[PDB]
Structures are given as C-alpha cells and as structure tokens.
Design a protein around this ligand. Structure first.
Ligand SMILES: Nc1ccn([C@@H]2O[C@H](COP(=O)(O)OP(=O)(O)OP(=O)(O)O)[C@@H](O)[C@H]2O)c(=O)n1
Ligand SMILES: Nc1ccn([C@@H]2O[C@H](COP(=O)(O)OP(=O)(O)OP(=O)(O)O)[C@@H](O)[C@H]2O)c(=O)n1
Ligand SMILES: Nc1ccn([C@@H]2O[C@H](COP(=O)(O)OP(=O)(O)OP(=O)(O)O)[C@@H](O)[C@H]2O)c(=O)n1
Ligand SMILES: Nc1ccn([C@@H]2O[C@H](COP(=O)(O)OP(=O)(O)OP(=O)(O)O)[C@@H](O)[C@H]2O)c(=O)n1
Ligand SMILES: Nc1ccn([C@@H]2O[C@H](COP(=O)(O)OP(=O)(O)OP(=O)(O)O)[C@@H](O)[C@H]2O)c(=O)n1
Ligand SMILES: Nc1ccn([C@@H]2O[C@H](COP(=O)(O)OP(=O)(O)OP(=O)(O)O)[C@@H](O)[C@H]2O)c(=O)n1
Lengths: 557, 557, 557
C-alpha cells in the first residue's frame, strides 16, 4: 500500500481539506483505488452530541454514523463511501485503548502513550486503509491521511508521534507528507518565517515534508519559493501554492498544472501498482474537463430559507449539492441566504428593515429551497416561502423539515385547516400534521416509486429506475391518516418506503417543479453525479428541466 | 489554600516522591493540615488491572481502591488517609471528560484538550485538595502535587498546561513549584547543562521554578549552585540538593537544614494560616528527632521468603513496615531476600548453588517473614520456612498467604494430613485447607480479639484495645470446619471478624513469637506509629519483645 | 535608572520603531529625561559601507557617524541628540570583544559567547544609558531598548541572552518588556496562534513580556485579547493594539488612550524619579495636542525629483521633514514622486509614457524639491526641474546635490555657459561648476549669514539669529572663482562657513521662495520644531510664507 499525509501550519484554517481530497481526486486520475482518513484532535467520539451551531453540520454516512463534517469533502472529491472508522478522533482512540486496558488485553503491563497508544493509532490507520471504499471491492492503493489541528499543539502531539513511527512501519517510498503553511503578506511583502518556524516544529517531532504547500494572498514570488526551499528539504518545484482560483473545483487542476502529481508518481513509485483502472483514470480526467468547461461556458438565483442562515457552515452539504448541479446546467449559482424568521408577519413591527431584505430575496429568486433545518423556530416563515412557490409557479425543493413544511402549507392553504402544525406542538393533538417514528431513522435506506406515477418530473430525473437509496435523519413523518386526502387533492406522494406506510417523496401534480424529500439528498451529491432532487431545482430555475431530463447536458456523448 | 508542585528533570527516576512527601512532612512541622496528589501520566485508570510484576505492588487504601504504589510513600511521610481520587491518571481524566461528553454536560459545544480538559484537571486538583485527609476533619492548608513523567513528554503535556493555568486560577503567593533535575558527574566534573535544557523546556510550557533540587552523585560544588542559579530564576540558596544520606528518613532533616522551609514559609506567606496545630508541629519535630536518634543510637537479620523476591519493588510496603519498626527497636535492619522456590527439595538437583544460598539465609535469620505473595508457585518452600520457625523457636510473621501457609504447615506437620493444600489445588476437594469467600474482600474492615486470649503477645502490642482496623486483599480463608481442630491443637485464632466466621489472626500458643494475619498490616505502618504485627517480629528477633510491650521504647516519656 | 525593551514577533517588519520611540515620546510626557538604543542583529559596524539602495538612507548624527537609518525615528519622536554608540550592532560588539581578546584584557582566560560577550552587551547598554542626550546635561531616567530581528533568529540569540541576564543586573521594577506580535486575519477571523508560538519562543530564552502589542489588520476583538492574555503572563488591559490611524504621529495618543503609560507608571514605579521636568511634561502634551489639532484642522502638492524615487526609504528623512512642517502650515501633504531621468529629452523617445507622467507631476506641483540624490544619473532632468521653478515663480528647495543643480542651472541658463557641469565630469576641466573639498565634510558644522542680507526669506525663518548649525555629507562645493559672478547676477549666497570660502546656502534675489542648502536640513527636523528650509518650502507652496514668518502658526501663544 501507499500513503500521503496532509498536515501542518502556524494556524488552524489554513486550507488542508482542499489540498487533501483534491490530492486524492488526482490519485484517481492515475486510475488508483483511493481512500481517505481524517484525524481529528478534538475529544468528541462522534458528531452525534455536537449541536449544529458549532463544528457545523452532522454529516451522515452510508453506515448512518454522525461523523465529522469534513469527511463529506472526501466523498464528493473521490466518489467513495467512507465508514464511522475513517474519522479518527482523540476521544475515539483514548476510548479504544482504555477499553483494552479494562478488558486486560495488555497482559497486565502498564499502558503508556508511547508505545501503546502510538501503536494503536498506527494499527487503526493500517486497519482502515484496507477497507474497500471504492467502485469495486478491492482494497485501496493510496490512502490520504489528513492530520487536523496544527503540529506543536498539545492536542495533536500523540498523532505526530504515531505518524513518525508509521514512516518506518510503512516504508519510505510508500509514505509521503504534504505540509500546508502560511506566507503572510504585510507591507506588500511575502514573509517566509512562519513556514521556517513551523518546519522547525515539524522536524522536531520527526516528520519530514516531501512537499510544502502555501496559503498565501498572492502568487508566491520566485524568491519566496527559493527562500522556503533553502530552509526545507524540498526542491523549489515542490513548494506548491493554492492561490485564488475561479472556484474550489479548479484546485485539482491547479495542483496538476503545478506538477504536483508528476512528483508523487516518482516519490511514491506508483509504477509499482489493470486496464479498468487505466481507463477509469482517463474517464475521470475527461469528466473533470467537462465540469470545468461547464464553469467557463447566465445566473440562477435560489433563495435558501431556514433557521440561522448566518451560520453558513451549518448548510455546507446543501451548498455543495447546488454547486455540483449548477455545473451540469452550465449556469452560475447565486444562493440568497434568508433567515426564515425574518419573513414572519411579526418581524414587520419588530425589525422591519431585515424583513424587507428577506422578502426581496424570496420575491427575486428563480427557485426556493427549504433546507431541512434544526428545531421549530423558523417554521412560520418557511410556511410563507412554501406558499409563495405553490401559488406562483416558482420551482421548489423541500428537504426533510422542508417536506414537513410543504405538507403543513398545502394542508394550511389547500385543505383550509389553519390550526395544523408539526407534531412538535404536541398538546394540540387533533391537528398534528405528523406522527412519531423513532424505529431516529438514520443511514442509507431504499425508497420505491408508486407504480402509476409515470407523469412525475422527479422519477424522470432518476432515469426511470424502480427504486433509489438515500440518507435520513428524522424522528417525525407525515401522519398516514391524512395522506389519502393529500393524494386526492394533488400533493401526490410519488415515493414511499418498503412498507408503504412512510412518506419519503412528494410532488405536487401539475406544477413546473415542486418537490420535497423526507431524506437529505445533499448527503449523496457528487461532483460528476449531482443529486437528482437538487439537479431538478436548478434545471427548473434555469427553465431547462425538460432538456436536462432528455439528456442535453450529460458530460460525454 | 496553598499548593506546592513537585515536577521535572531530563530523566524519569530522578527522586521526586522523597522530595515530595518529604517536603510535605516538613509542612506538618509548621503545624499545617497537609494533603498530597500524585498525577500519573500513564493510561491505566487504577492498579487493579496492573500485575505486580511491572509497576509493582497494588497499594491499598482505606477506601479499598487499588492505587498507584507511590501514594503509600505519602501515607507514611504525612500520616494521612488518602482516597481513590488522590491518584490522578491520564486514563482517569480522559474517561471523566469523555463521560461528560456523552452525557452532554458541554451543552453541545465541541470539547477540546484546551480549555475543556485543562479545566477538568484544575477542577480535579482543587476538588481533591478540599478533602480532610488529616487527624481532624478540617480541609488541608497545603497540598503537595507531584507531577509524574518528565516535562516535555507527549504524555505529560496536558498536565503542564493545566498546572500553568492553575498558577492563575490559584494566585502567586498561593502556588509554588519545586523542579527536580540532574547534575551528571563525568570525568569527575558536575555538568549543569541537563538542568539548563530542562529549565528551558519548563519555561517553554510556562511554569517557573521557585526552587531547583538536584539529583547528583556528590555534594554540589559552590560553582555548580552558582552556574544553575545564573541560568534559572532562583537565588543560589534555593538550589536544594538531595545528596547521599544515612537513610531515606533523614531527607526531611536534610531539606530543613538546607533552609528549604525557611524559604517556603515566605514564598507561600504561611503566616496567613490554632494552638493545636502549633503544638502538633513541635510534637512532629520531637518524634522526628526520636526516630532519627534511634538510627544513630546492633543488627536484626530477617529472612523475607516469597515468590520472585528479585522484583524488590513488589514487596515495597513490607520493607517500609520493617524499617519503621526497626527504628523503634534501635536496631539495624538486614533483610535477607529468599526466593521461596529455591528452598524446595526439587531445587537441590535442579539448581543446587542457589538452593544452598537460600537455606543459609533461612538458617542465619533472627526472624522469618512470609510476606503475602502473589499466586501459588512459591508455596512448597514457604511451607518449609514456616516449619523451620514452628519447630526451632525462631520469631515469625505470616501475612495473608503467610497465614494460609502457617495453617497449611501446622496442618501438614502437627495434625499429620500430608495431602493438605491451598484451595487453589481445587480438584483434590476433601483436603483443601481453605474456602472461597468473594463477598475479593478489600479495604479497611474491623477485627475483634477472642475474649479469653489475655496471654497473647500480639493483643498485648495492640495496647489491650478491644478491636483493630486493617486492609485486606483475599479471595480465600481457612476452612471454618477445621478451625476447632487447630484451636484445640494450639494454633489459636486470637482474632476474627464481626461474624466470628472468618480467620483474621492466629498465634501459636506457647511460642516466643509466631503470628500470622490474613490482612496486610504493612498498608497501615507509619514512621511514628509502626504496624504492631511487624513491631513484634522485629522486637522478638531482637529478643526484646517483653520490654517493647512494657514501654521501654516509646518516643517521648 | 529604568529601562524598557521593545522586541519580538513571528516576522521582521511588524511595527517595533513606532511602538518604541512612540513609547519613549510618552515617557517625556511624564517629564522624564529619555534616551534610546537600537540593537541591530546585522554584521555591518556602521552604514558608511552600506549603499543607499538596500537598508536605505545613511542617517547622520551630530557626531557625524553614518548610523542605522532607524535611529532618526528616535531623534524626531523624543527630541534628543544620539551618538555613534546608541546603535549597537552584531558586527560592532564582536569587534569590541575581539579587540579586548588581542589586547589581552581577559587575563589569558578563554573568551566565550556566554558569559564574556553577554557581559559586554550588558556593559554597553548600561554604559550608553548614562550619556546625557537630552535638553539638559543630566543622565536619562528611562532608556528604550529596541531589539531588532525576531526572537528565535540565530542572529538575535546573543542579545536575548544578554537582555535576560540584564533583567537581574538591573532589577525587576527597573526593567520591563513590550513584545510586538502578529494577529493574522484570514477567512475574516483574527488568529492568536503566531502570538502563542512566539511567546513560547520568548519564554524559552527567558524574557517575560509585561505587555504584548499586536500588529493586526483590525481592531482586536474582545475575545482575541482574552485568548492572548489566557496564554501570556499579562492582564487583558496590557494587550496593546497599534491599529490603522489617521497618521503615524497619532500613535503615542493611541498608546496613551489604550492606558499603556498608566501601567508603565506602576510597572516601573516611576514615582521614584524636579518642577522643570513636570512642566516640560505638560508642555510636551500641549505641543502634541497642537500638532494633532493641525492635522484635524487643504492640500499642498510637492514634486520630489531625484534618482530612483521608487526606493522610497532612500528619501525617508526628507519625507518626515516635509510632514513635520506640513502640520505647522495646517495643510495636507501630497508628495509626487518623480524619477529625475524620466524628465530628460532622451526619455521622450525611449519610454514616452513615463516621461509624460513625470512632466505632469512637475507641472502640477505647488513646490519643487531636489532632495540631495546619490551619484550623477538623475542630473540632466533635475536641471530642467530647477529651470521650471526659476523661470515660472514656483517655490523650490535644493538639498546638497540640489544646491549643486540650482547653481548648475542658474549658470547654464542665466550666464549662458551651456557646457557647465558638476566636477563629477572631471576631464572637461575649464567648465567644472564645482571643486573638491575632502577635509568628506561630515557632522554638525556652523553656518553664518552674510551680514547685509536682511531681505532674505530664509534668514527670516531662522528668527534673525546670527548663525545656524547643520549636518553635511559632501565632497564637492561650488567653485569660489565663480561665486562673485553668481552673487552679481542675483544667485546670492546668503550663508557661508567660518572661513567664508564655502557655499552653504543660496537664495535667488526677488523670487517668492527659491532656496538651496549644501547641508541636509532633514537630519535636524523635529515634530515640534520643523527644519526651517523645509518649513519655507511648504509655507510658500501654501502661499502663506509671510504669515508663518510673522508667527500666525506657532503652537502656543
Ligand atoms: N473539497 C472541499 C474542501 C473544502 N471545502 C470547504 O471549504 C471550507 C473548509 O476548508 P478546509 O479545506 O477544511 O480548510 P479549513 O477547515 O478552513 O482549514 P483546515 O486546513 O484546517 O481544514 C468548508 O467550507 C469546506 O466545506 C469544500 O467545499 N470542498
Ligand atoms: N497550545 C494549544 C492550544 C490549543 N490546542 C487545542 O487545539 C485546538 C486548535 O485550535 P486553534 O484553531 O488553534 O484555536 P486557537 O488556539 O484559538 O487558535 P486560533 O486562535 O487560531 O483559533 C484548540 O481548539 C485546542 O483544542 C492545543 O492542542 N494546544
Ligand atoms: N518517602 C519515600 C519515597 C520514596 N521511597 C522509595 O524510593 C523509591 C522510589 O523513589 P521516588 O522518590 O519515587 O523516586 P523514583 O520513582 O525513583 O523517581 P521519581 O522521581 O520519578 O518518583 C521506591 O523504593 C520508594 O518506595 C520511599 O520508600 N519512601
Ligand atoms: N517522548 C516520549 C516518550 C515516552 N513518553 C511516555 O512517558 C513515559 C516516560 O517514561 P521514561 O522513563 O521516559 O521511559 P523512557 O522513554 O524509556 O525513558 P527511559 O529511557 O528513561 O526509561 C514513557 O514510559 C512513555 O509513557 C512520552 O510521553 N513521551
Ligand atoms: N517614529 C517613526 C517610526 C517609524 N517610521 C517609519 O515607518 C517605517 C518603519 O517602521 P518601523 O517602526 O521601523 O517598522 P519596520 O521597520 O517596518 O519593522 P520593525 O518593527 O522591524 O522595525 C519607516 O518608514 C520608518 O521611517 C517613522 O517614520 N517614524
Ligand atoms: N533563521 C534565521 C534566518 C535569518 N536570520 C537573520 O536574521 C535576519 C531576519 O530577517 P528576516 O526579515 O527574517 O528575513 P527572512 O529570513 O527572509 O524573513 P523574511 O522572509 O520575513 O524576510 C535575516 O536577514 C538574517 O540576517 C537569522 O538570524 N536566523
């Protein structure tokens, strides 16, 4: 096997993940089977305790674990299904060694941070790097290991020990390291010294960088590359630079044009790794040239309406799912961020100025999106945003709480029933629009189209396939008692579960595009294969939905 | 409250504990209420998993937890009952913060090594420093904090962060630090540089030493003190030196004569802390002058016979209990270490040379001691050592497995019954000398003298008090069915438990001193109050037992 | 005596000098006698070898040494005459200890970087801090020590050793340190970690900061101050911040409003230092409020015409002399930078675009300034700039080479004599406008007004005083043979030397303001007392020269 560490810097937030999965996207250009592990220095075992206000969205796996949010950036860049084990954390590995301590697997020795815990970390990395995350069941050929925090943190010290020892447990010419570092510009001059002091830190703990990659406000000057390479064990051609680019999807072409892989090919001796891989490599490059061409080659404006949209990382997957689809439509994406509570009739006396800004965004947008918010607060405004797109023929997608609110609105305006509300307003009883279903429903579950719905815009985007598979995170579903009334009035539930009891998709009959999903489709959007409910929202906002379904926008003929 | 850190060095094993409890023994000279916490960098939560072969003896508390062995050094030096919480460990504190993470006590924040875990360590130290470990229920006035490992270890990095922040959570003029450091002598010259490089390490993590204390092969030269104080923020009078001394019990007088406390009095402003304390201070000095005088002011030879006596830390408490008692008898202690298996009739053909060395030690000794060994291996030789002291009137003490073997021997030689054995040889059934009693029996439990036994040598040493309280660690007891036969033949069980079913002490009727205890009395021996079963063993080995009971050797008239 | 170190950072160029002399300007607000030392890590003994292209202008002392350029920033901020010894450099101190090594002043000991060279640095700082640099001959009360480079450089390591030892040779409560450090803003967030890593570096070498001062793109957030003070031994009120301000002369008011001195008063216990000082303190504050008011309370455009004006530090003193004077005139300064060679008739075919930009600047400006350039290259354009201000009544000042070019132009256009040139064009002989006078003429020399010249605008600005004292740097003077012809034609030499042979000032008779000086007056401009030849240039460019001479712009009535 081969391995690539990505680590480093004098600051957290320097750029690692885009240098990580982006390096891993280019390993796939070579045809390689590829995987990724994110080592987190924080002490949470999983994101299941972490509220979406800090550390952001609880990204959800095929295996239904609530992981680190960043893992998602690797399931888009590489096109892989990761597992709950691919997110190593400081709380996860202290728990695993402490479990073995009380089980007595150390044969009554004292157990130490070195060597026992640093062995555990190496034994975890080489365990997880066997798992076949890729489009065929063979073990990966390269693993990208991203070390979070900064080298020289008292929180990241166990992992730089474990990785140093791993440079020997794995050989040189099988392991390599990319160190990501800061070139601050002040008084209009690129200063090298934070890279010198952080490389001094790196060699102290015993890792040696095979590349340096700079966060800089500028293109690195020719002398800045020379004054970094005069102070580190790299040639001047391995001081990589992730400068400003037209969009984040260009970074793997930037790295490849900086000859980043033409070194890793030699430095990891990758001639030592079938025709299927060689072909899938060339196809991945062709599909990259296609999505890149679709950026160079008109705007679509979408209002995303939810709770606390100020906290923009809390909707990260939704943004990326709109970006992947917008490159298929060749159209520039312009998300308007609306706080749902600023739409409310009460906000007009409380905070009038922001209420007009919110309503201008809703009124301007070519599509509306209710994104599957957290908790009840935004609901009253999200109803009025769903009403705005039901009545006037604006394209719409509701995700999770958005299907809940598409159904509350269609109840509250088409059936009358003005008292109806989410099951969250428990003591109203008779007018609850939803029912509890704890089984929380999580992870990849199927959904089956209702066999008559040949008219459907959404089941056309899915290619007329009989079923779909999707991620879930819900404790409530629409009350089955009401669903005949909604189906008879035209809010047709075009997809349901295995039992047929659960409301998984709706489409409003005879509207240009009004969909909702109980699942979160943004947790399976990929850059070459955009998630179909979001592709339909962009394509109908562009007024091109028919031609996307007919195939005028696939990447290769 | 006031606090004293003891930390440091370029090596583990430099001398901390003797500089720690010894500094705490002198805080008690001032009359202060005193406590101690040992911070261990290892990842075991407790010594209950740790086999006695590495990290040594599982020291046992009043509260019955199997602690770090070193805690014992503080219950002898200070005269305090500690608790399971006074041994902070890396496995204990990661478990406590990870429990709060899954309970959700962090209100859905991400939880970090800084500040959350470094707050947990400070909140633990100031929690535990409230507990009244002393001879009256008031909270302690000084806490001695010993930081294990070395500063600059990747295992000790969380604790030097937590202690730095603690220098502010507690004030300066309430916290002080003693750093213990190496002066190697090579080519006959004292080199200062390992102290310079380790003090550079110390100030990097942000602690500043109010004293330095040197491990050195010599008295520090006047220039060595000056060349350390020219490189650290200490006066030349605060470079303390724990040099070679007549015995370890002299170290608090060495520190006091080096004016160590005449600085801490000012540096912790201890004028800011009743007549009872002032008196108990002067009495502790008088009792120190007494035990010191008893060292300056003839040898007693004792054979300690057990499994794997090569592993001398595995019997540490037993050695210290013999030392405390030997200073009461004014006699020099000479422990002969015997491997019990080298006494066996089989060892004579297998390894003849060591078998003669073992038997010479047994034949020479003025007393025999079977120390409460671990597992079955040594048993056959320990029987012959008990027989040697039953028949010939040699003084004897059996501790735990030693009472078991005193009873197996008296069965095997006085009752005949040559097939009899420990309950460990389970499938013999009918001839098992013992019975299972799991309740493991642990911690401080009472023991009551049998009301007729006024003749007893051991119940005389206990001052004619009606009951005693002692630590236990046993899964087997002598089978109650047999005890009438043993009592009738003269192996009188002079002490039993609350129920009267359990065999807690035996004394053989009409022998100069042949005792065993099912408890471990070495876990309550103190330097001014020696544990009575061990005092009797030394005093009878000295042939002075009568006069020790009559009071010719108490410290003050 | 008291002392203040200014040091630090992860980068060179962070802001030290403005935090240094600015802190020293506020020590003078307290009435204190004040001095400054700049410690340079570079190996040049003096700027006399250093060409003005790199490290910039060779600033010149009262004592005529070619010093570090930065010393000037302290002679403006404090109002002091420094000496060649106030610029400590790595080349200067290795030379001084190596001289004592060959003289044998070490009594045949081996001489070492510690302690001998670190003693030399301390013995130099306390030597120089005695020298009475101030407006009365008493020794200074505070010394500001600026440590150049960055802490943790292999070039600055001898000085942080010497300063650490100096924290003891001088007492605490006599020495304090200000550490200047970086808060980079990326992704719109202020990151603290470069300050944590550089403070870790600082405490390693053993200095402790009594203040931190941040270079930041922003006002520091309340949490950024707290997260620096949680990681350093400073209160949150001693994390100072030199943010963007209207001009550099506001920084001492910014520091004073951040309560910077209200701490140093207590931290250096400055109550332990006469009515003259107390008065001169209040007067310095009043004069600061005046120059500050003159910034708050119309533009003057000046073309500065010389060689290589792209290298803007090479004219630093000239810029500051124009700033000090512009605050007296209450008018905003706008220096147009002209490359003198772009004015040439040859530049019109060679590089036409830049030639028009140069001539637009010359044609726009309210005054012309020829700044005393280095070498011959710019001369031909500087002639045409002097002609432009002779003929059209534009205000003018020529400094050094500017007097040379004022005289070459007046010769070349008023006397005819079109072949005339600087003595630099040696082989023309008969038409050389100048003569060699090596005595280089340097340092503070007098100049005496010619006793009839009562009409003069410049000798009016000097207050009708009989003589002036000024800095020089010239190897050429105007040929005395010609001076009668120039005086008779109206280029009256209104000031000459002690002998009357040397051309020190000219004024063209009956022009609104056309002055030149052979001396460099910008080497004695001060913020409360602007250098008179530059005050006249700004005041005549403002068309207010009469009223400045009559006194409509002095700071206090
Ligand atoms: N392939 C990627 C990589 C990053 N991002 C986005 O960029 C931001 C985080 O970038 P990252 O590469 O993780 O850098 P930081 O986390 O800012 O810093 P670090 O280097 O510490 O990860 C997030 O919006 C993340 O979703 C993304 O959309 N796609
Ligand atoms: N010396 C330190 C400081 C912090 N941490 C931990 O490592 C993480 C790094 O986060 P970081 O971005 O460094 O936060 P700050 O320390 O505030 O750094 P910044 O100021 O850039 O946020 C911290 O959250 C904390 O978990 C650490 O290990 N060692
Ligand atoms: N009051 C004390 C202190 C120490 N010792 C003994 O000395 C040895 C350990 O000494 P210690 O002070 O702990 O030093 P080390 O552990 O060798 O090193 P460190 O400084 O790391 O603790 C053990 O036999 C311990 O029982 C003792 O009998 N009584
Ligand atoms: N860089 C290191 C090395 C080891 N350790 C841990 O800290 C303990 C210190 O034990 P030590 O006595 O240092 O063992 P060694 O590393 O072998 O040192 P020595 O050679 O003196 O035993 C080690 O057991 C290990 O738990 C650590 O934290 N950091
Ligand atoms: N009282 C001062 C201080 C500085 N400057 C100017 O500001 C620049 C240099 O600022 P300085 O304070 O020296 O910062 P740097 O040299 O950039 O960085 P350092 O902190 O390393 O000195 C130069 O134009 C210098 O003349 C000035 O005009 N007046
Ligand atoms: N590790 C180093 C590197 C350089 N220097 C010296 O200290 C000076 C500091 O200048 P600096 O501004 O640090 O130059 P660079 O090293 O290039 O740093 P920068 O990239 O910010 O210019 C250098 O010129 C050199 O004299 C040093 O002492 N130690």
């Amino acid at each position: 096997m081969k391995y690539v560490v990505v680590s480093g810097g004098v600051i957290s937030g320097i750029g690692k993940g885009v240098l990580a999965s982006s390096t891993g996207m280019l390993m796939k250009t070579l045809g390689l089977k590829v995987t990724s592990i994110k080592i987190d220095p924080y002490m949470n075992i999983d994101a299941g305790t972490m509220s979406p206000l800090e550390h952001g969205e609880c990204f959800v796996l095929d295996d239904g674990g609530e992981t680190d949010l960043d893992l998602g950036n690797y399931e888009r860049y590489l096109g892989v299904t990761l597992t709950k084990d691919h997110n190593i954390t400081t709380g996860k590995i202290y728990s695993h060694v402490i479990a073995k301590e009380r089980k007595g697997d150390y044969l009554g020795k004292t157990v130490q941070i070195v060597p026992h815990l640093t062995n555990a970390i190496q034994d975890w990395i080489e365990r997880v790097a066997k798992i076949p995350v890729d489009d065929t069941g063979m073990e990966p050929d390269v693993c990208i290991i991203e070390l979070g925090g900064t080298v020289g943190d008292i929180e990241s010290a166990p992992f730089v020990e474990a990785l140093r020892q791993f440079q020997f447990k794995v050989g040189k010419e099988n392991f390599a390291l990319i160190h990501v570092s800061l070139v601050p510009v002040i008084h209009g001059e690129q200063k090298t010294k934070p890279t010198q002091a952080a490389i001094k830190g790196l060699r102290s703990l015993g890792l040696v960088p095979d590349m340096i990659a700079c966060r800089c406000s500028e293109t690195l000057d020719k002398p800045t590359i020379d004054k970094i390479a005069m102070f580190c064990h790299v040639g001047p051609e391995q001081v990589v630079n992730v400068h400003d680019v037209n969009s984040t999807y260009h970074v793997p072409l930037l790295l490849l044009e900086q000859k980043m892989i033409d070194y890793l090919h030699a430095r990891l001796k990758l001639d030592e790794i079938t025709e299927e891989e060689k072909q899938r490599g060339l196809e991945l490059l062709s599909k990259w040239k296609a999505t890149t061409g679709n950026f160079d080659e008109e705007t679509v404006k979408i209002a995303l309406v939810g709770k606390y949209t100020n906290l923009k990382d809390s909707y990260l997957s939704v943004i990326k799912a709109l970006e992947h689809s917008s490159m298929k439509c060749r159209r520039k994406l312009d998300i308007k961020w609306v706080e749902a509570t600023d739409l409310e009739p009460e906000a007009q006396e409380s905070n009038k100025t922001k209420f007009h800004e919110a309503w201008n965004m809703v009124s301007t947008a070519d599509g509306i999106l209710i994104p599957g918010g957290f908790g009840v607060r935004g609901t009253e405004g999200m109803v009025l945003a769903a009403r705005w797109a039901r009545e006037n023929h604006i394209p719409f997608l509701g995700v999770c709480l958005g299907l809940q609110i598409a159904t509350i609105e269609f109840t509250r305006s088409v059936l009358g029933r003005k008292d109806s509300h989410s099951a969250e307003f428990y003591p109203d009883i008779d007018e609850k629009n939803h029912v509890v279903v704890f089984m929380m429903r999580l992870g990849l579950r199927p959904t089956f189209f209702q066999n008559e719905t040949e008219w459907s815009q959404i089941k056309k985007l899915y290619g007329d396939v009989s079923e779909v598979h999707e991620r879930h995170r819900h404790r409530y579903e629409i009350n089955p008692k009401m669903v005949d009334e909604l189906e008879n009035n035209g809010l047709i539930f075009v997809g349901k579960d295995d039992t047929g009891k659960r409301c998984e998709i709706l489409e409003l009959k005879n509207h240009p595009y009004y969909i909702a999903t109980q699942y979160h489709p943004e947790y399976t959007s990929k850059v070459l294969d955009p998630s179909k409910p979001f592709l339909g929202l962009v394509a109908a906002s562009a007024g091109i939905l028919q031609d996307v379904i007919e195939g005028k926008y696939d990447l290769e003929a």
